C-alpha cells in the first residue's frame, strides 16, 4: 500500500536541485572546513548567486556566497550549474552520540540585488568517521559500538510509522545504553535520521536489497542484468540521505550472496561519498564489497565452519592470514522470546579487543500484529494467524521489547 | 639456534644493548654463530637471544642475519616480544585468554595478541608451560589454541630437564641438589629445576 506520507511541492523555475555537505578537519579537530556543493537546474542567469550560511542556534558561525561556476575538472571546463562554498569554522562543536552538536546549514539562491528565489535548510554535524589501521573511528576516537537491529514496526498499523513511535523507540534505546542503530533492512522514514541527529544515534543506512530465498543467494546479485535495479536502489539511497551527521556507515543490503553487482556499487559508493565506510554481510561477511568484516551470530569462542561461508568465531576471524579490517557484528545475540543467554561474553570480548568493536543486537522490537478473538479482546498474533501459509510462526517476534514498546 | 646473549640482571635490561660500546661485543656472539651453523637443515629460526630488553644494537644485529642469512627467520624476544627485531611474536608465557598489563611491555593473551592493529607476525611462544615441580595444569587450553588458531604456531615448552645437581651425604649416598646447597649465596634455590624429565631422565 502507500504506507509513508504523500505530499506536494511548489518549487520554483530556477531553483536548487541538489546540495552536498562535506565537513573536513585539521588533525586536532580544532578547524573545520565545510565545503557546500549546490547545484541548481533552470536557465543560468549571472546575477543568480548562492549563500551558504552557518548558523549554532541563533548565533551565525560562518557565510558564504558565490556565482555559480565550478572549477575546471576536464579538458570541456566545469559545471556551469553548480557552485562549491568552502566555510571556515574554528573549533566546531564536534557531533557525536554522545554530545550530538549540531548546526543548521542554510542554503539560499539569491539574485545579485538580494531578492531570494528559494531556500533549502539542513542540520550539520561535524564529524569524521574513518578507518584507520583496522580501527572504525569517530572524531579520532575508536567506537564501540552498543548497537540495535530496528524494523520499522507497528501492531496495529504495521509498517506505518508516525513521530511518536519514533521517539518512544529512541528515548528507550538511549536509556537502556545504545547508541546505534542499524536499518534493517531498508532505508527508513526521513524523519528517522533527523531524530538521530538530533537525540545522538549512530545509524547503518542500508539499501532495499535481499535476495535471501534465491538459490544461490547471489543469483540475481551475480546478473548483470539486474545490476541497473540494484544500482539504483544504493543510487538512489546515498543521494537522500548522504547529508544527514547521524549515517556513519553505508550498508550494500542484506543476505544477497556476494556477485559482482556487489563489488561495482562498493565501489560507486566509494567515489561518491568517501566520508563513510561501506559494510557488506553476503558471502561470508569478509568479501572485497566490505569495509568492516560483519557477520551474522558469529559465536565469540566457537567456530561454525560451513562450506564456502564459514562463521569463524570473531577472535579467531581477526587473526586470520591478511585480515586487517575491524569486525562489527551487523546480527549478534538473536533476542527470539526468553533468550540472551550468554550476552556478557560478547561484551567481554567487546571490551577486550580493539578490533571488535561491538554489534547490533537482533532486533529491537517483535512483529507481532493485533488480531481480535471474538468479544473484540486484542490479542498478539505472529506467523500463520493471518490465514498466511507457507509461514514462519513465532520467528517474527524476536525483540528486546514487545510491539507495544514495554520491555523483555 | 640462539645466541649467547642475556643481560637479565640489568637495570634497566637494555643497559648494554642500548649501548653502542657494546656492540662490537654483541655483534661477535651473533655472527660467529651464524658462520658456524648457518649449514645445519634442522636449524630453521636464528634467536638473537634471551631476555636483554630491546636496544638499537639488537635492530642491527637482526638486520644483519637477514643480509648474510635470508634463509631463516629470526626472532627475539626482548622489548615486549613483538619489536622490529623479530620476525615472529615470540612471548615468554603469555597466557592463553587473560592478559597481563605490565607497563611498557604488557603480555596479553596470544588470542589477543595476534588481532592487535597493524600485527601480522605468527605468534611462537618461546618459553610456555613453565614445568616447575608438580605443574602443567591447564597445558591442554594452549594445544586447544594452537589448533583453532592459524597464526598460534605452536611454542616451546620450559623446559626439558631439571638442572639438578648430584651431593652425596654422609654415607656416599647420593642425592640431587638445587640452588643454595653449595653453599651459594644469594641463590634462586628450586627454580632451577623446571624439567619434564629428571636430571637422569626419567620422566615426570
Ligand atoms: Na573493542
Ligand atoms: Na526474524
Ligand atoms: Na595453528
Ligand atoms: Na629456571
Not at 183 to 210: F, K, M, Q
Request: aromatic share 10%; proline share 6%.
Amino acid at each position: 500500500g502507500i504506507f509513508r506520507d504523500v505530499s506536494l511541492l511548489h518549487k520554483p523555475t530556477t531553483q536548487i536541485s541538489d546540495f552536498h555537505v562535506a565537513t573536513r578537519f585539521n588533525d586536532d579537530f580544532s578547524r573545520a572546513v565545510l565545503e557546500a556543493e549546490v547545484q541548481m537546474c533552470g536557465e543560468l542567469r549571472d546575477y543568480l548567486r548562492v549563500t551558504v550560511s552557518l548558523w549554532q542556534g541563533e548565533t551565525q558561525v560562518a557565510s558564504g556566497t558565490a556565482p555559480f561556476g565550478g572549477e575546471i575538472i576536464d579538458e570541456r571546463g566545469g559545471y556551469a550549474d553548480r557552485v562549491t562554498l568552502r566555510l571556515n569554522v574554528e573549533n566546531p562543536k564536534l557531533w557525536s552520540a554522545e554530545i550530538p552538536n549540531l548546526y543548521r546549514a542554510v542554503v539560499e539562491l539569491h539574485t545579485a540585488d538580494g531578492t531570494l528565489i528559494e531556500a533549502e535548510a539542513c542540520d550539520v554535524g561535524f564529524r569524521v568517521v574513518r578507518i584507520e589501521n583496522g580501527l572504525l573511528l569517530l572524531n579520532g576516537k575508536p567506537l564501540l559500538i552498543r548497537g540495535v537491529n530496528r524494523h520499522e514496526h507497528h501492531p496495529l498499523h504495521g509498517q506505518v510509522m508516525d513521530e511518536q513511535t519514533m521517539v518512544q523507540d529512541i528515548l528507550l534505546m538511549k536509556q537502556n545504553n545504545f547508541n546505534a542503530v542499524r536499518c534493517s533492512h531498508y532505508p527508513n522514514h526521513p524523519l528517522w535520521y533527523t531524530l538521530c541527529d538530533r537525540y545522538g544515534l549512530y545509524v547503518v543506512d542500508e539499501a532495499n536489497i535481499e535476495t535471501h530465498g534465491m538459490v544461490p543467494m547471489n543469483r540475481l546479485t551475480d546478473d548483470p542484468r539486474w545490476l541497473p535495479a540494484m544500482s539504483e536502489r544504493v543510487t538512489r539511497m546515498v543521494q537522500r540521505d548522504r547529508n544527514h551527521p547521524s549515517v556513519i556507515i553505508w550498508s550494500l543490503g542484506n543476505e544477497s550472496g556476494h556477485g559482482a553487482n556487489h563489488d561495482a556499487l562498493y565501489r560507486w559508493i566509494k567515489s561518491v561519498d568517501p566520508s563513510r565506510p561501506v559494510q557488506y554481510e553476503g558471502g561470508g561477511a569478509d568479501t572485497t564489497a566490505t569495509d568492516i568484516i560483519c557477520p551474522m551470530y558469529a559465536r565469540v569462542d566457537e567456530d561454525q565452519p560451513f562450506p564456502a561461508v564459514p562463521k569463524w568465531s570473531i577472535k579467531k576471524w581477526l587473526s586470520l592470514p591478511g585480515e586487517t579490517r575491524p569486525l562489527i557484528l551487523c546480527e549478534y545475540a538473536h533476542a527470539m522470546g526468553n533468550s540472551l543467554g550468554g550476552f556478557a561474553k560478547y561484551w567481554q570480548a567487546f571490551r577486550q579487543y580493539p578490533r571488535l568493536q561491538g554489534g547490533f543486537v537482533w532486533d529491537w522490537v517483535d512483529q507481532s500484529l493485533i488480531k481480535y478473538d471474538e468479544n473484540g479482546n486484542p490479542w498478539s498474533a505472529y506467523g500463520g494467524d493471518f490465514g498466511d501459509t507457507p509461514n514462519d510462526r513465532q520467528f517474527c517476534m524476536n525483540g528486546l521489547v514487545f510491539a507495544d514498546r514495554t520491555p523483555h
